[PDB]
A paper describes a structure:
B4GalT1 possesses a type II membrane protein topology, with a short N-terminal cytoplasmic tail and an α-helical transmembrane domain responsible for Golgi localization, a stem domain (amino acids 45–125), that is believed to be mostly disordered and whose function is still unknown, and a globular catalytic domain (amino acids 126–398) carrying the sugar transfer activity. Previous structure-function studies of the catalytic domain of B4GalT1 by x-ray crystallography revealed that the enzyme undergoes conformational changes upon substrate binding and during its catalytic cycle.
Despite the absence of the lid in this structure, the position of the Trp loop (amino acids 308–311), with Trp310 facing the inside of the catalytic pocket, clearly indicates the presence of the closed conformation. In the closed structure, we observe that loop1 is displaced deeper towards the catalytic pocket than in the open one, with an RMSD ≈ 6–10 Å. Specifically, the one-turn α-helix usually formed by residues 274–277 in the open conformation becomes a β-turn in the closed conformation (arrow a) and residues 280–284 transform from a random coil in the open conformation to a one-turn α-helix in the closed conformation (arrow b). The observed position of loop1 in the closed structure is also such that the lid cannot be in the open conformation because of steric hindrance. Between them reside hydrophobic contacts, which mostly maintain the dimerization interface: residues from loop1 (Val271, Gly277, Phe278 and Tyr285) and close to the Trp loop (Phe318, Val322 and Phe323). The homodimer structure solved here most closely mimics the one that normally exists in the ER, or alternatively, in the Golgi in cells overexpressing only one of the players needed for heteromer formation.
Numbering used by the authors:
A (entry chain B): 126 to 342, 364 to 397
B (entry chain A): 126 to 344, 364 to 397
């Protein structure tokens, strides 16, 4: 019935100022984005998007950062004319953090809501400075956070495929998702760039200016999606996001 | 007879001023480094170095840049107490450039002079700003150019394992060297990161400050495409005081 959305959205505004010297009230953010449905779900009214994107945020005790993330990304994602939903994967307990495992949980859980075909894995503390940085999938795995605010050496904050990146369902399934046994922060050695290589994939990215983000301030075949185990303890449908609280075990 | 050189050389000075305004005369540079022998060869007089390093530069019509590279790196390499030689691999003709294939030639040709055990592959237009950045090999593949001088975003110039990197002879042979069929400038698409992964190796590097480099300016297929399938024709070999230049025909796409 509806027409397909254009290939490039005409609603983009380009670079935007990101400042964190202003308190955020999510009740106001919700009234500013009234087309977002309960649970953080949105689709264009005027056209059909081919981008069915689940944005997955690994999370634990970062509510202030999340307020800023929602305040800044909901307008961006709509301007990009995406058919998206927001899934916050909250790691229950005080175990060592396991980013990769939570991303696997988010993939499995988001698919219970809707047949997403693209998955954006995003740290809660990275805001894109230009809405030309598409939050969706490409013919190759996509690295969305390319460089940081002040355009310095960026590998510490984003590694090769960290910070914000995107994988289609097929790309995610080809590598059997992320590993589940990397507890803690391992740097550019725990980057799953290795998994993309084994399956003959490379990295796509925008240019470093469009890709700027600002900060709020083998074993593969057996360790991954097919061996994932976890227990969901809570699911909360807030106006602007879904939060899933899970027990992912211990190292 | 001689003692082993220390693990860290006592001659290191740390950060360095790098400027590209003074014209360079290689006859004067040779008089500044009188211990460098014909062909750009040096070994310490006072100790035996465990680092037998061939520095291989893929090259074509960049003589001005090459002057600066020699002016700045010969002092650095000597201070690092290395047993090294300088090999410039000049691609004959003005065909489309093939960085990776030239690197394979340099590895094969350097070994005809001397039994090097470490190979540093360095773009001619990258100068290290700190002599603590070791131009030699490690237990894992080594990425020497980590970050750029000022605007630190470095991925376009260094990729994952480009710019300046080092592979021991064993590490190089394990991945069957570099590919030979990547014609042109491919960026991080021509990067051999996949080959290191395929063989269960990772990247070692210094921290981004020690690893800072400045750019000269004024502004499956692995097992079958590599060293074992390399073909080329040497057209000239010239032995200058400060470097060996090998001019080769590496064919066309």
């Amino acid at each position: 019935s509806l027409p397909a959305c254009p290939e490039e959205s005409p609603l983009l505004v380009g670079p935007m100022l990101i400042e964190f010297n202003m308190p955020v009230d999510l009740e106001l953010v919700a009234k500013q984005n009234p087309n977002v449905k309960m649970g953080g779900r949105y689709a264009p009214r005027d056209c059909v998007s081919p981008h069915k994107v689940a944005i997955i945020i690994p999370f634990r005790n970062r509510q202030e950062h999340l307020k800023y993330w929602l305040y800044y990304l909901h307008p961006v994602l709509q301007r990009q004319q995406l058919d998206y939903g927001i899934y916050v994967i909250n790691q229950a307990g005080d175990t060592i953090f396991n980013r990769a495992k939570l991303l696997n949980v988010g993939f499995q859980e988001a698919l219970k809501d809707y047949d997403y075909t693209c998955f954006v894995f995003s740290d809660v503390d990275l805001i894109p400075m230009n809405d030309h940085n598409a939050y969706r999938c490409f013919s190759q795995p996509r690295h969305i956070s390319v460089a940081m605010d002040k355009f310095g050496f960026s590998l510490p904050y984003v590694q090769y495929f960290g910070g914000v990146s995107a994988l289609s369902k097929q790309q995610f399934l080809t590598i059997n998702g992320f590993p589940n046994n990397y507890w803690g922060w391992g740097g550019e050695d725990d980057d799953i760039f290795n998994r993309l290589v084994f399956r003959g994939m490379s990295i796509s990215r925008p240019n470093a200016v469009v890709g700027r983000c600002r900060m709020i301030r083998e074993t593969m075949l057996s360790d991954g999606l097919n061996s994932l185990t976890y227990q969901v303890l809570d699911v909360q449908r807030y106006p602007l996001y879904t939060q899933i609280t899970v027990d992912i075990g211990t190292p």
